[PDB]
Amino acid sequence: MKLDIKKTFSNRSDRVKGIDFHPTEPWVLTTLYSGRVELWNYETQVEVRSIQVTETPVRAGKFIARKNWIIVGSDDFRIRVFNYNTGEKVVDFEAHPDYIRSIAVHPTKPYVLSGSDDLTVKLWNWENNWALEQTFEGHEHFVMCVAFNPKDPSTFASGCLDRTVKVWSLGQSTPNFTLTTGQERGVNYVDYYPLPDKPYMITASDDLTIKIWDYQTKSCVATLEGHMSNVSFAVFHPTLPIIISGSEDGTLKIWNSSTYKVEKTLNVGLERSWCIATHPTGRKNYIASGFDNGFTVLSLGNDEHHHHHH
């Protein structure tokens, strides 16, 4: 590959806590500490739609493109769903009795997971009236991040300030396993490597480290050091051999996913970094990050997302 980073679109706003790419429209969703959410076309740089959802922080937001929805979770305990074409608020319910940190959407089935400061993950089913179909209990501190395994989304991972990642199966009440990270300040984020050649997950911590894990053996594969403040997230790029992380040190870091050495450090000048998204199909190798003072959409270069794409 050849890293060739271009700034596609950056704009200033209140602190961006959640961020996501639409899979077929050139849109990015940002969810703000102010309770506002913005939908931007980053190619034309024109706001498609925006909503003052609540007065509390909105920490989580995802597209559900197959329903033309966004789904968001906020510190006022509520999950809300809006149709992004009409602005219709579809549903609005109390989901947890404490802050909602993270929302994940199943790739094919009508399932949403929410992770919360109430120590739980909850599974909601939108084809069943958004009923609470399962609550996953076992964590001992705030659940900061939930992520389905894209290679087997009957399973998902929860990253928790109790220093563990728990991996669960839908329909079963205890973890398939609990991975102890040695990241003593807790886990802020968890992501799966999406390709079938490595059974890998990655965790980010306030302890300044990022760790790569074999989820079949539970062994630490590598520890990535160099962020100088809390690491907010770390993710595998879906098609490029890299890892991308962001930190309260104000930087994004791009790491070689084979050597585990840092390749690039970028401070985009928006202060602390909080959240990350990568384009679902690697379109123009777009990534986006949200920060204290706004967001940025970057293109990482021209390497193809599909073998023999040209």
Phi, psi of 59 (to 5 degrees): -80, -20
CA distance 292 to 232: 12
Q: How far is CA 121 from CA 118, 141, 202, in A?
A: 9, 12, 19
Looking at the domain assignment, is residue 148 inside a domain?
yes
- For residue 143, give the amino acid letter: V
- Residues with Cβ within 8 Å of residue 64, at least 6 apart in sequence: 70, 71, 81, 105
Beta bridge partners of 285: none
Using CA atoms of 31, 35, 39, 42 in order, give the dihedral in degrees to the nearest 10.
-60
> 3-state SS string over 93-161?
EECCCCCEEEEEECCCCCEEEEEECCCCEEEEEHHHCCEEEEEECCCCCCEEEEEECCCCCCEEEEEEC
Looking at the domain assignment, is residue 2 inside a domain?
no
Task: Name the one residue in this structure whose structure tokens are 């969810």.
Answer: 31
- The C-alpha angle with vertex 75 and arms to 69 and 77, in degrees rounded to 5, equals 75
CA distance 53 to 213: 37
Looking at the domain assignment, is residue 292 inside a domain?
yes
CA distance 225 to 17: 24
Instruction: For residue 124, give its domain range.
Output: 8-310
Resolution value in angstroms: 1.8
Beta bridge partners of 147: 157
Closest by CA position to 149, among listed 213, 187, 195, 101? 195
- Residues with Cβ within 8 Å of residue 136, at least 6 apart in sequence: 120, 121, 122, 123, 158, 166, 168, 173
CA distance 152 to 92: 29
Contacts 24+ apart (CB under 8 A), 121-128: 121/146, 121/156, 121/158, 121/168, 122/95, 122/96, 123/170, 124/79, 124/95, 126/67, 126/81
Question: Using DSSP, how many helices (H) and how many strands (E) does the chain show?
Answer: 0, 28
Sign of the alpha-carbon torsion through 251, 302, 285, 45? positive
Sign of the alpha-carbon torsion through 289, 226, 156, 72? negative
Contact between 141 and 161 (Cβ < 8 Å):
yes
Tell me the chain's radius of gyration from C-alpha atoms. Answer: 18
| Cross-sheet strand order for the sheet of 251-256 | 231-236, 242-247, 251-256, 262-267
Q: Solving technique for this entry?
A: X-ray
Using CA atoms of 128, 131, 133, 137 in order, give the dihedral in degrees to the nearest 10.
160
Contact between 281 and 305 (Cβ < 8 Å):
yes
CA distance 39 to 19: 10
Q: How far is CA 148 from CA 35, 59, 190, 256, 268, in A?
A: 26, 18, 10, 24, 30
Neighbours of 33 (CB within 10 A): 19
Closest by CA position to 299, among listed 280, 275, 282, 274? 282
Neighbours of 228 (CB within 10 A): 12
CA distance 247 to 298: 17
* CA 208 to mean position of chain CA atoms: 18
Looking at the domain assignment, is residue 223 inside a domain?
yes
Closest by CA position to 210, among listed 247, 239, 175? 247
260: left (phi > 0), else alpha (psi -120 to 50), else beta?
Answer: left
Q: How far is CA 216 from CA 94, 172, 177, in A?
A: 36, 19, 10
Neighbours of 188 (CB within 10 A): 25
CA distance 99 to 8: 32
- Residues with Cβ within 8 Å of residue 150, at least 6 apart in sequence: 107, 192, 194
Contact between 19 and 291 (Cβ < 8 Å):
no
Looking at the domain assignment, is residue 3 inside a domain?
no
Closest by CA position to 204, among listed 194, 195, 196, 213? 213
- Token pair belonging to 3: 């890293």
* Overall number of domains in the chain: 1
Beta bridge partners of 61: 72
Beta bridge partners of 78: 94
CA distance 19 to 38: 10
Contact between 276 and 300 (Cβ < 8 Å):
no
Looking at the domain assignment, is residue 170 inside a domain?
yes
Looking at the domain assignment, is residue 52 inside a domain?
yes
Looking at the domain assignment, is residue 278 inside a domain?
yes
Neighbours of 199 (CB within 10 A): 15
Length of the chain: 310
The DSSP symbol for 15 reads P
Residue 115: CATH number of its domain: 2.130.10.10
Q: Are strands 36-41 and 58-64 parallel, antiparallel or unpaired?
A: unpaired
